[PDB]
Amino acid sequence: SEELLDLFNRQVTQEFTASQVYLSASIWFDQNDWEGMAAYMLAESAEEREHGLGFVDFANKRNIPIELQAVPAPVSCAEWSSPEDVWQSILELEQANTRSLLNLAEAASTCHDFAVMAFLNPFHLQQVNEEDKIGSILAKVTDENRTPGLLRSLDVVS
Amino acid sequence: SEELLDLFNRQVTQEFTASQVYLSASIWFDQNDWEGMAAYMLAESAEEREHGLGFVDFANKRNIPIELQAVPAPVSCAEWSSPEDVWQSILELEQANTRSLLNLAEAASTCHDFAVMAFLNPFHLQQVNEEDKIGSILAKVTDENRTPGLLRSLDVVS
Amino acid sequence: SEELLDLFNRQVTQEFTASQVYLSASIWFDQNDWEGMAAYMLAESAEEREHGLGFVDFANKRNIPIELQAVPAPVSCAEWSSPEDVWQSILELEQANTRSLLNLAEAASTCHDFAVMAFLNPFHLQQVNEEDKIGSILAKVTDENRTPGLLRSLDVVSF
Amino acid sequence: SEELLDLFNRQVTQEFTASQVYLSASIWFDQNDWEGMAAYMLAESAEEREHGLGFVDFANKRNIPIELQAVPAPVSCAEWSSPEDVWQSILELEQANTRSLLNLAEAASTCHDFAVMAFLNPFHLQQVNEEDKIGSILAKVTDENRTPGLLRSLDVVSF
Amino acid sequence: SEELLDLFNRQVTQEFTASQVYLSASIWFDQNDWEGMAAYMLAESAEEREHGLGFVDFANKRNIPIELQAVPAPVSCAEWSSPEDVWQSILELEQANTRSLLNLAEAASTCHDFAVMAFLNPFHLQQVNEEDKIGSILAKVTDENRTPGLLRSLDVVSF
Amino acid sequence: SEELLDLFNRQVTQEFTASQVYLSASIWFDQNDWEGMAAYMLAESAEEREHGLGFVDFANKRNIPIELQAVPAPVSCAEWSSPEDVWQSILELEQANTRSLLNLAEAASTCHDFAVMAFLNPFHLQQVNEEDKIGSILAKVTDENRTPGLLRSLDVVS
Ligand SMILES: [Fe+3]
Ligand SMILES: [Fe+3]
Ligand SMILES: [Fe+3]
Ligand SMILES: [Fe+3]
Ligand SMILES: [Fe+3]
Ligand SMILES: [Fe+3]
Ligand SMILES: [Fe+3]
Ligand SMILES: [Fe+3]
Ligand SMILES: [Fe+3]
Ligand SMILES: [Fe+3]
Ligand SMILES: [Fe+3]
Ligand SMILES: [Fe+3]
Ligand SMILES: [Fe+3]
Ligand SMILES: [Fe+3]
Ligand SMILES: [Fe+3]
Ligand SMILES: [Fe+3]
Ligand SMILES: [Fe+3]
Ligand SMILES: [Fe+3]
Ligand SMILES: [Fe+3]
Ligand SMILES: [Fe+3]
Ligand SMILES: [Fe+3]
Ligand SMILES: [Fe+3]
DSSP: OHHHHHHHHHHHHHHHHHHHHHHHHHHHHHHTTOHHHHHHHHHHHHHHHHHHHHHHHHHHHTTOOOOOOOBOOOOGGGTOOSHHHHHHHHHHHHHHHHHHHHHHHHHHHHTTOHHHHHHHHHHHHHHHHHHHHHHHHHHHHHHHTTSTTHHHHHHHHO | OHHHHHHHHHHHHHHHHHHHHHHHHHHHHHHTTOHHHHHHHHHHHHHHHHHHHHHHHHHHHTTOOOOOOOBOOOOGGGGOOSHHHHHHHHHHHHHHHHHHHHHHHHHHHHTTOHHHHHHHHHHHHHHHHHHHHHHHHHHHHHHHTTSTTHHHHHHHTO | OHHHHHHHHHHHHHHHHHHHHHHHHHHHHHHTTOHHHHHHHHHHHHHHHHHHHHHHHHHHHTTOOOOOOOBOOOOGGGGOOSHHHHHHHHHHHHHHHHHHHHHHHHHHHHTTOHHHHHHHHHHHHHHHHHHHHHHHHHHHHHHHTTSTTHHHHHHHHOO | OHHHHHHHHHHHHHHHHHHHHHHHHHHHHHHTTOHHHHHHHHHHHHHHHHHHHHHHHHHHHTTOOOOOOOBOOOOGGGGOOSHHHHHHHHHHHHHHHHHHHHHHHHHHHHTTOHHHHHHHHHHHHHHHHHHHHHHHHHHHHHHHTTSTTHHHHHHHHOO | OHHHHHHHHHHHHHHHHHHHHHHHHHHHHHHTTOHHHHHHHHHHHHHHHHHHHHHHHHHHHTTOOOOOOOBOOOOGGGTOOSHHHHHHHHHHHHHHHHHHHHHHHHHHHHTTOHHHHHHHHHHHHHHHHHHHHHHHHHHHHHHHTTSTTHHHHHHHSOO | OHHHHHHHHHHHHHHHHHHHHHHHHHHHHHHTTOHHHHHHHHHHHHHHHHHHHHHHHHHHHTTOOOOOOOBOOOOGGGGOOSHHHHHHHHHHHHHHHHHHHHHHHHHHHHTTOHHHHHHHHHHHHHHHHHHHHHHHHHHHHHHHTTSTTHHHHHHHTO
16 A cells, blocks of 8 residues: 555656646647647647646545655657657657556555545546557558658648 | 837838738739638738738827838749748748837837837737748648649648 | 730729828828718728729739739828818829729720620729719818818718 | 835826816816716716726735825816817826826836836827827817807717 | 747746646645635646746747756645645745746846737736735735634635 | 805715725725725725715706815825724714715705705715614624634625
8 A cells, every 4th residue: 555655646747747748749849830739739738637636636535645746857859850759759658657557556456445446447448548549640640751741731631 | 209200100111011912922822723822811911901000090199190101012923933932921021020010119118108019019929920820831831842732732621 | 905904904003002092091181180081081991902902803813914013102192281182182083093994994895805894894883983972072071161160060970 | 116106106196186177177068068078078087087996906916005195176177268278178187197107107117017017008008099089079179169159069969 | 038038938837836836735725624725726726837838839939949847846835734834835936926927027128029028918917916816815814813713614615 | 055055065075085085995905905895995985976976966957166176185094903993984984974964954954945955865865874884884893803813704705
């Protein structure tokens, strides 16, 4: 349960970290005139923060102490030079989100914390949906960027 | 305040001059079967004239003498051979608009003309928005035009 | 014909020239506290501009090359000292608009340009209405201004 | 700065002073059977008071101490014998309102009080509109009063 | 100017930092069963974030480079033992927010960045309103806490 | 009737004087974070001015010469150190209002000015209502202030 409490706290930090990485992606896309991709990243930035807020709320109700940690500066953004790079980082971000939730769930299972397991169930399912959606967009971006200018049409229309 | 009155009068001319350049761009686009880009230019031509009329109305209220100058014929059209050339000239036009507004604000600031500075505030913010939008369209135009026919396909879906 | 093309192109200039003369009239009226007359002129300024855009749009469709000319400074304001002077210049301006359209239609007739003649028909009729309306306003202004202050009383009530 | 605080506090007095001068104008107009002009003045009296309350409310929020001063007796009525005299005093009053606001904004600028400058922006623009409107009414009144009875005819129709 | 750009970038960090301090206040309140005060702090956490996004959006449009900085761990919460302590840190936070906006506007003034000054105007006015509201809540919290249990009684009704 | 015309003119001044004292109370309350009491005072400041305007309108109709006097600066604010002090001064203000209306009615009665007495009737009844309301608020304020913080709790619920 000490491990559970420590991981629950780190999960807040993870959600807020992810929020900031999505924000840096939104900024990179806007700077490079990919306004449609930027709006998607901005929406996820708000949603990851809300996820973090949901964990905080559950923890307060369940007497899991929360100590808010620094949210580190997002760093992958230094390296991005095409939309494909940005989507690839976002995929890895969500894969790491998924792994941290599964690790938290396994800590909860070990100490028979059925309430935490129940709380995590809709998050496990949303991660399935999200990794699928991001993986698909990444495939489409990679394919369309094979012809000069063509990826600009993904952004403008969809 | 002489400088302020002079610059305020020149700003009207600048707005009507830009309205004419936008009309020239709309004609070039229509002649070359870019009806969607032509519609955008025609809307901006009307907006610029409305801005000129706004300055005229304020000047009349505040007793800033207005002497309507000739609106010079647009010339940049003679060098346009692709939509990228046209959008680049429109970007330069809006950048010149922005600079003329900043110089006018500075002349107002110098003679403590708070009412003129207050009047200009929404125009300064509008120019921020417009330069961003124009700069973004130009980047998309330049990229899409890397593939024969692709730019055409995205005039039509707009 | 080359002549119809030139005149069609000049017609755009005439409509924008008229738009600017109307704006100049609105400014004189506003500066001199005739806000009702000023509103009328501002409405016409917008409408003349709309007429010019209608000509441009037809030209683009019909492959009549358009080259936008300078829109001259409106200079009639130099001799405006009363509302009657302004309305007289406005009458002359609409008389010139009408003549310009008639000359254009004559060039179209000479080269059998039935589409241009058909396009101009509603504008010929509008000019009839407009010259009549401006001529009547000028008569009213001229008459009311025979008594001090009376013309003011009717900028306020009307327009 | 101490100067911005003093001027901000004086601005409340100026708005209430103006409110009372407008009420005095409404009374002169009512006593002399210009009920249309009187209504206009009464509307402005209420509005100037509302402007003063807006300044007080901002001051309270921003911890600018307000000490309410005497609102002087409006004395311009002593030389009012025609509507033109009243409108001329009203023009001068709004010209003073504008100067007062500009002096305030200058003190705010000098001490980098961006919040006070931002607060004043809509009032600077309102003063532009108001000076223009009063200047125009004064011109109309002055012109119509050149013919006996004519100005009356336009208190009734308008205002 | 490059400096103004740095101060603009740091204002984003300032807003996100404030967001997290408001979140830490919400947590302390919830942990101590002050759910009403907690909800208020959560609302401000969202709003401070929204302000930071507004700055980011303006910067992207105006080509002001945005580099997202670390958001430091909130530390004041280690020291809070009563709602009065928390409200006092929140007041200092907003006072700090106000000072940093004024310093940014001053940098903008120095380099004639009229667009930046215009953008900031609503935020200056919002800080005036917010400091007033927080200052007032703190004063009520301080007063009500003089009687055991009374403060509780007004987390429950108000908030 | 000289006395009546004099008192009628002094009544306008009294109403505007009370409007200013109410504004002063609203400022003291706002400065001391009693926003609910401040709102009440601000509403009364507007009402008193409306009463003054009512007297002005009647006077103009009935040809009672009106000469607008200075509206003196409120001074009672200098001695206010708690809400009870403020409410006590407002009670005294309304009591003075009532007395000035009664004296004016008496002067009207003496010169048989039935129209002025009829005009005053709803104001006499309004003052009855207002003195009762103010007297009642003062009693509640005085009682609630016996316990630290308790008065504050009841400004907020109003
Ligand atoms: Fe999502
Ligand atoms: Fe989602
Ligand atoms: Fe996500
Ligand atoms: Fe635009
Ligand atoms: Fe626009
Ligand atoms: Fe534009
Ligand atoms: Fe017309
Ligand atoms: Fe016409
Ligand atoms: Fe028409
Ligand atoms: Fe007004
Ligand atoms: Fe006014
Ligand atoms: Fe108004
Ligand atoms: Fe730097
Ligand atoms: Fe930098
Ligand atoms: Fe740096
Ligand atoms: Fe807020
Ligand atoms: Fe807010
Ligand atoms: Fe805030
Ligand atoms: Fe850096
Ligand atoms: Fe009342
Ligand atoms: Fe009442
Ligand atoms: Fe009362």
